[PDB]
Design a protein around this nucleic acid. Structure first.
Lengths: 229, 1031
RNA sequence: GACUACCUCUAUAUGAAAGAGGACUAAAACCAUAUUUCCAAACUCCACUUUG
């Protein structure tokens, strides 16, 4: 993952320096302990149902980045089917998520800046390519790793039914065989590089260290292919 | 719908043509009323807007094509009858729908129970698909039951297309036929007759504003309020209030105008169409303050009414004011404003030569005599040797100071007066008067020999300029003869005859970007070969960058910009390179091809006009400026074809030589400037290089809009005088003892910035012993003003000066190696982008990037370069301040001469102006010491940030100019690499006070990264905020 | 919204004047700077930001 979110003012508390794995995970656990009530009369049975599968531990969140014109669609997939979805503006309004400084010169709006938060919350993001008016593919991905597929003929309804099948294949590959052996080689290489630096801080400049990084990169690339299998 | 204008309709663009008799929608170069049939072809987009106006925001893709084929016949296709039925219709419908919508027909007269029409779209759609019994819905059958909805949309399109069409035709210039136009006219005549136009307290009782603003607060203070929703239900409460007072909104026209101003205040501070970003304040909508503001933004429309037809009385076009001639006034005032601000900076330098303490207009004839009386005579000779390369005697300082102010005054007095100009007889100035009156010519004056010692030294300024950049060291003498001996090209002082011509560093840096490319995609190959290197910290590169700079400016630009064939052949390459590949997404699609027998100044006058007409539309949506990268590629491909058709392609290979060549470089040069340009030259010698370059850019925009064939020859002769003053520019003295009289007066002065035993060193003495060396930014400050200001700055703290650890910081590391590594590491990141996620690697890169930034602030601090940066920053603040005070000076003649058109007559003029609370004597005081650069003359009085507080007491006249003063301070400082934050204005008694000042960050190595660097330093920012807050 | 614009026209006074227009009016952008930010390509029409 890449832990990089902008300062966010959430329900009166400001979270800053969210550029590490410890400050992002302190923000996600704040969001699930944050209490709420939902006001709508048409969507009482829908929105309160969405914040129950998500709260439950055995649930997978799907982001689906730019679903409509200005609309993101967070989907929760339960362990046995049951895919529901709300707009991401409903999610921000129930949990009162803002930007802490919206007028800094290095910021954009919440429709652009919140995508960093949502790619740390979700497991899968979906981004349609829309090749010349009509669609082309869906481009699935995992967020823990970066294994990216590309659904070709699946419809929006068809695609959701494929994401539990997309998650099963990636998890099984990681658990055993090639991933265990390939990961070990990368760890050994990193240790050698780490030790190399320790003797001399100037080892990074040398070609021998540069050549070692190329080997590590190749191993990582080979490792993703095992997960896609 | 969204864009009536700036839109292709019949493969033709649309413009609006305003007139005093009405508005008019027209194509591009035509004049006909096409407002009927442009508005009729703009109707397939009303259908596309209504489909979005009936559908909900998580757009179900198949409810979006049921509706679009029920209205349009071609749009309708086929869909499964079962698929729409499976979904729930109410969830996907718009908020206006999902319940019962009621409307009245357009044709129906009045409102009755029978006339109103009821539609339940969710219920209506459900029953129609119940009758549909087929695999796919059959269009004739489904549509027939949809008739109650199709009649709604036809009514909606036809009524909204009729309000827009009425809005265009009534949009005339200086209207007196409209409601709100007649009302403004009525209030304007009750001020010239010094009366009271309106009473806020009595119009707020008819409006019942006590009943509002407590229901506005009862919604804002309502329990369980949401900041995502509060602006939308503060909107509904205001609308509910109007509904109750509606009987006298239609019959008063000032209770109506009172409503529009309170409608408009409510969406600037509680916005509904503006990307909210912030919580509004309950301070903002309270009784007493909401009617303080309405009085303030209804008087603003009266003042903008007066000066808009004081403008129509200065130019005698109050009955024939067209959309074109307002656009023509806008151009000639862009040049006149730019030309005034360079006559005020040259008047500043003529102040410092004669008498630095005068705070009035020295270019007044009589007050110059009182300023001439007190001259320190030893300073004037030393000052004259800096602006001019020649030495003056004691007997000649009676007559050279009247020759200078006679070069500014007859030009500066003609330009200020808002009237018709004759630009011939604007640049002649044969004589100047000397009173003690005896009018002397300029031809027989001392200044004549400052030309033929000046125009004839052009071939040696080029040779001595080349030695400074070490061009001769890295190139042979036979390889510079063939760059000045080319046929037709012949080293002109002109730069470019076409507006919006790029600079060289924009061309060379971006031309590097098209040649060196990843070569992995459908390449946008421009076939480039000379944009080879970017290694600015070498010296072989620094010789070829400087030789390419003056081949381009002094030879290539004059020929390329005036050859029809040369310019067209480069435009035709760029157009056929873009629209000859697969797909519809092509950027230079709607810009036309250059005609034959068309001058290059007439094609780029079209590119200028398209760039400015499409600027509002390109900023509604986040669109890039494709005209800026079009102007790039024409000039990038143009300078490559020049350097290869001619054999000058060895410039890409410097190859430092060892054999000393004692050979001569002969260049040809001729110029037909007669001795009538010998008064505009004297103004250009009093300007800085930045001022000269930017007045030349504005002079070519105005020259490409004139019609007469002479009086363009007037401008292209004055434009060559600018380029002859940029050749000298920054000569400076070479002998030490011509700027200081002693070794101790030097050592006293230079120890204001290093103040130590460090003056007997290698960077501060010549090479050996105790002979001084002069600093090129320490007399650059003496030449202009700023010398008593920067001495006050560095005398505040002793950490500002150069200390012993700063020179010791220049021997810590090699520095060149750090830059070599920073380059090698960066290059690697491109092939392996996963190095960014390697903590150990990014921790090293950051360390190497810090060692560069710390060394270069130490390199600049030691050589006192940062004194030059402060001087440049200081000039750009005082001149932008002076650009606002000359807009207020124009508005005084647009409102005063309208009163005179309606001390015998001067008594009745000013007594009106204190009834409007216009330009006072306390504002003319503040408008004088800004426009006359009186911050520079030592004694402070008020700081720089208290001058920007003075600028918005003068310009509080209108909010367009008042709001933009503080937006311009933040942009000048952001150009110099900083930020500024400003503690709030309601807490600091409406003054500008710095909340935070920080260096701008650069964000190396990707987009979601934390490796960054400061654009200047933390030590410079502290130095900068002590210049802003300094009395 | 000083920064985080302003002005003109538009009345079925509401699904809303919550609409269009502006080189027309301002600010920017463009311009002869001292060096680190990889870069290239990316037509047009239409939504309009609300737990309703």
């Amino acid at each position: 993952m890449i832990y990089y979110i902008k300062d966010l003012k959430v329900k009166g508390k400001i979270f800053e320096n969210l550029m590490n794995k410890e400050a992002v995970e302190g923000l996600i656990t704040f969001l699930k302990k944050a209490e709420f009530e939902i006001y709508s009369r048409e969507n009482y049975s829908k929105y309160n149902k969405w914040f129950e599968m998500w709260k439950s531990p055995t649930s997978s969140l799907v982001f689906w980045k730019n679903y409509s014109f200005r609309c993101h669609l967070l989907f929760v997939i339960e362990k046995d089917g049951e895919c529901l979805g709300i707009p991401a503006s409903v999610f921000e309004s129930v949990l009162q998520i803002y930007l802490a400084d919206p007028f800094a010169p290095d910021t954009k709006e919440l429709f652009v800046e919140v995508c960093n938060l949502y790619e740390c919350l979700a497991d899968v993001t979906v981004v349609e390519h829309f090749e010349a008016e009509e669609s082309a593919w869906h481009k699935l991905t995992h967020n823990e790793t970066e294994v990216s597929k590309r659904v070709y003929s699946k419809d929006d309804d068809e695609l959701l039914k494929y994401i539990p099948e997309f998650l099963d294949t990636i998890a099984t590959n990681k658990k055993s065989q090639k991933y265990n052996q390939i990961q070990g080689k990368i760890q050994e290489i990193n240790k050698e590089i780490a030790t190399l630096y320790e003797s001399s801080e100037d080892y990074i400049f040398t070609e021998y260290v540069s050549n070692l990084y190329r080997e590590s990169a190749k191993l990582e690339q080979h490792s993703k292919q095992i997960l896609k299998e | 719908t969204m864009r009536i204008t700036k839109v292709e309709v019949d493969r033709k663009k649309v413009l609006i043509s305003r007139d005093k008799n009405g508005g008019k929608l027209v194509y591009e170069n035509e004049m006909q009323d096409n407002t009927e049939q442009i508005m009729h072809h703009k109707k397939s987009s009303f259908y596309k807007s209504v489909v979005n106006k009936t559908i909900c925001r998580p757009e179900q893709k198949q409810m979006k094509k049921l509706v679009h084929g029920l209205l349009q016949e071609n749009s309708q296709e086929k869909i499964k009858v079962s698929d729409v039925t499976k979904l729930n219709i109410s969830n996907f419908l718009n908020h206006r729908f999902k319940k019962s919508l009621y409307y009245f027909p357009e044709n129906s007269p009045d409102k009755s129970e029978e006339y109103r029409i009821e539609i339940n779209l969710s219920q209506l759609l459900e029953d129609s698909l119940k009758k549909q019994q087929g695999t796919f819905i059959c269009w004739e059958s489904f549509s027939k039951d949809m008739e109650l909805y199709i009649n709604w949309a036809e009514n909606y399109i036809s009524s909204k297309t009729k309000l827009i069409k009425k809005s265009i035709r009534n949009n005339r210039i200086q209207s007196t036929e409209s409601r709100s136009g007649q009302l403004m006219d009525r209030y304007m005549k009750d001020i010239l007759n010094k009366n009271k136009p309106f009473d806020i307290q009595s119009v707020s009782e008819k409006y019942q504003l006590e009943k509002l603003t407590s229901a506005l607060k009862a919604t804002f203070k309502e329990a369980k309020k949401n900041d995502k929703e509060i602006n939308y239900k503060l909107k509904s409460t205001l609308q509910n209030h109007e509904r109750q007072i509606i009987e006298e909104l239609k019959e008063n026209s000032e209770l109506n105008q009172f409503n529009i101003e309170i409608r408009k205040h409510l969406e600037t501070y509680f916005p509904i169409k503006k990307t909210n970003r912030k919580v509004g304040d309950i301070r903002n909508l309270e009784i007493g303050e909401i009617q303080k503001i309405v009085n303030h933004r209804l008087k603003n429309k009266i003042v903008q009414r007066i000066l808009q037809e004081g403008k129509l009385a200065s130019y005698e076009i109050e009955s024939t004011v067209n959309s074109n001639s307002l656009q023509k006034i806008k151009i000639e005032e862009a040049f006149a404003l730019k030309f005034i601000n360079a006559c005020l900076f040259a008047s500043n330098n003529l102040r410092n030569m004669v008498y630095p303490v005068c705070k009035k207009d020295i270019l007044m004839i009589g007050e110059f005599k009182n300023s001439f009386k007190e001259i320190k005579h030893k300073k004037f000779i030393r000052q004259w040797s800096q602006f001019f390369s020649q030495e003056i005697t004691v007997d000649d300082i009676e007559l050279a100071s009247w020759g200078l102010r006679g070069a500014i005054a007859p030009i500066r007095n003609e330009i200020i007066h808002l009237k018709k100009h004759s630009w011939k007889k604007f640049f002649n100035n044969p004589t100047f008067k000397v009173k003690k009156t005896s009018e002397f010519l300029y031809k027989e004056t001392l200044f004549k020999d400052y030309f033929y010692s000046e125009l004839d030294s052009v071939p040696e300024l080029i040779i001595n300029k080349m030695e400074s950049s070490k061009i001769l060291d890295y190139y042979s003498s036979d390889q510079l003869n063939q760059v000045f001996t080319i046929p037709n090209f012949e080293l002109s002082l002109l730069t470019s005859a076409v507006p919006f011509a790029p600079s060289f560093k924009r061309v060379y840096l971006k031309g590097f970007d098209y040649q060196n490319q990843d070569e992995a995609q459908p390449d946008y190959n421009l076939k480039l070969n000379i944009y080879n290197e970017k290694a600015f910290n070498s010296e072989a590169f620094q010789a070829q960058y400087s030789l390419f700079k003056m081949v381009y400016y002094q030879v290539f630009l004059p020929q390329f910009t005036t050859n029809n064939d040369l310019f067209k052949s480069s435009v035709d390459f760029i157009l056929t390179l873009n629209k000859e590949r697969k797909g519809y997404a092509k950027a230079f699609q709607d810009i036309r091809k250059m005609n034959k027998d068309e001058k290059p100044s007439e094609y780029m006058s079209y590119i200028q006009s398209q760039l400015m007409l499409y600027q509002k539309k390109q900023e509604e949506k986040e669109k890039i400026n494709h005209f800026e990268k079009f102007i790039n590629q024409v000039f990038i491909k143009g300078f490559n074809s020049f350097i290869e058709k001619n054999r000058l392609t060895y410039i890409c290979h410097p190859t430092k030589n060892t054999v000393p060549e004692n050979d001569n470089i002969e260049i040809p040069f001729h110029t037909d400037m007669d001795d009538s340009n010998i008064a505009f030259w004297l103004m250009c010698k009093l300007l800085d290089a930045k001022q000269l370059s930017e007045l030349r850019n504005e002079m070519i925009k105005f020259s490409c809009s004139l019609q007469s064939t002479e009086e363009i020859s007037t401008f292209t002769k004055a434009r060559e005088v600018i380029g002859l003053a940029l050749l000298n520019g920054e000569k400076g003295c070479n002998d030490w003892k011509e700027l200081f009289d002693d070794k101790e007066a030097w050592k006293k002065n230079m120890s204001l910035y290093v103040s130590e035993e460090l003056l007997q060193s290698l960077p501060y003495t010549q090479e050996d012993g105790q002979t001084p060396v002069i600093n090129r930014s320490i007399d650059l400050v003496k030449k202009y003003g700023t010398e008593t200001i920067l001495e006050k700055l560095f005398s505040s703290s002793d950490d500002y000066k150069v200390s012993a650890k700063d020179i010791a910081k220049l021997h810590e590391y090699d520095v060149t190696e750090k830059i070599a590594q920073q380059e090698s590491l960066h290059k690697q990141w491109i092939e392996k982008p996963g190095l960014a996620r390697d903590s150990a690697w990014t921790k090293k890169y950051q360390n190497v990037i810090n060692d560069i930034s710390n060394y270069q602030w130490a390199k600049t601090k030691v050589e006192l370069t940062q004194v030059r940066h402060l001087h440049q920053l200081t000039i750009d603040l005082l001149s932008r301040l002076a650009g606002y005070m000359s807009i207020a000076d124009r508005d005084f003649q647009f409102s005063s001469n309208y009163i005179l058109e309606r001390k015998v007559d001067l008594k009745q003029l000013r007594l009106t102006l204190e009834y409007l609370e216009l330009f006072d004597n306390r504002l003319k005081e503040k408008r004088n010491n800004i426009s006359h650069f009186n911050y520079l003359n030592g004694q402070l009085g008020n700081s720089i940030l208290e001058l920007f507080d003075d600028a918005r007491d003068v310009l509080s006249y209108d909010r367009k100019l008042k709001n933009a003063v503080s937006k311009s301070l933040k942009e000048i400082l952001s150009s110099h690499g900083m930020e500024v934050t400003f503690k709030p204005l309601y807490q600091t008694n409406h003054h500008l006070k710095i909340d935070k000042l920080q260096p701008k960050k650069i964000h190396h190595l990707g987009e979601k990264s934390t490796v960054s660097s400061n654009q200047v330093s933390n030590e410079y920012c502290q130095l900068v905020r002590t210049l802003l807050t300094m009395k």
